């Protein structure tokens, strides 16, 4: 099924041609164009009052990366390196070393925000829900080096946004 978008021949009756000449001389579709914009000025604007008003999001939103931890206090990360092995941009660097207690934890877990693509592949690959993409997105920095995240900075993000991230995962883990 196809339709001819522009295959309309105009009628050549005296009334039709008089109307076409009137539209040409007395600009008619031009007045319609004016009227449409008049109708929308009288309409309500769509602008929101940022930063006092924020655009809507979803619990699945991908933002600032963060390392979570168990309710006991121990970090969830076990240095299985799935996130490092699955990152499309190779933005994660992990070095592991058996801790004094014996549990295997990262001696270095750096995520480079200037190289990250915010795909969320790491948070899917993680088998313990250790690394997540937090809800934060207003974390712009004045210098480049501040975007090269360390293990300590990611742990601070996890401890800061934990209230939001726990609820976000709680409202989405069933879909996964």
């Amino acid at each position: 099924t196809y339709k001819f978008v522009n295959m309309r021949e105009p009628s050549m009756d005296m009334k039709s041609v008089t109307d076409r000449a009137a539209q040409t001389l007395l600009w008619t579709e031009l007045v319609r164009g004016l009227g449409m914009t008049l109708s929308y000025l009288f309409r309500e604007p769509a602008t929101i009052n940022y930063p006092f008003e924020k655009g809507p999001l979803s619990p699945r939103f991908r933002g600032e990366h963060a390392l979570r931890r168990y309710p006991s206090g121990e970090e969830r990360c076990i240095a299985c390196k799935l996130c490092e092995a699955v990152c499309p941009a190779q933005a994660i660097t992990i070095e592991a070393e058996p801790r004094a207690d014996g549990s295997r934890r990262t001696t270095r877990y750096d995520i480079d925000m200037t190289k990250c693509i915010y795909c969320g592949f790491c948070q899917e690959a993680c088998p313990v829900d250790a690394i997540v993409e937090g809800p934060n997105f207003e974390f712009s920095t004045e210098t480049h080096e501040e975007l090269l995240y360390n293990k300590e900075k990611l742990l601070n993000n996890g401890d800061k946004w934990e209230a939001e991230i726990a609820a976000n995962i709680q409202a989405d883990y069933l879909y996964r």
Partner: protein, 45 residues
């Protein structure tokens, strides 16, 4: 329990308009020319 997922309502969604709805409005060409000429005549007088 039963499976739950995003689904259309049991009776299906309502109709969705897609055809062009450019309305027709305004006087005829004869009437427009007549109004213009009458305004010109009144101004002339």
């Amino acid at each position: 329990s039963k499976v739950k997922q995003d689904m259309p309502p049991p009776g299906g969604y309502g109709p969705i308009d897609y055809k062009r709805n450019l309305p027709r409005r305004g006087l005829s060409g004869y009437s427009m020319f007549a109004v213009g000429i009458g305004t010109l005549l009144f101004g002339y007088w």
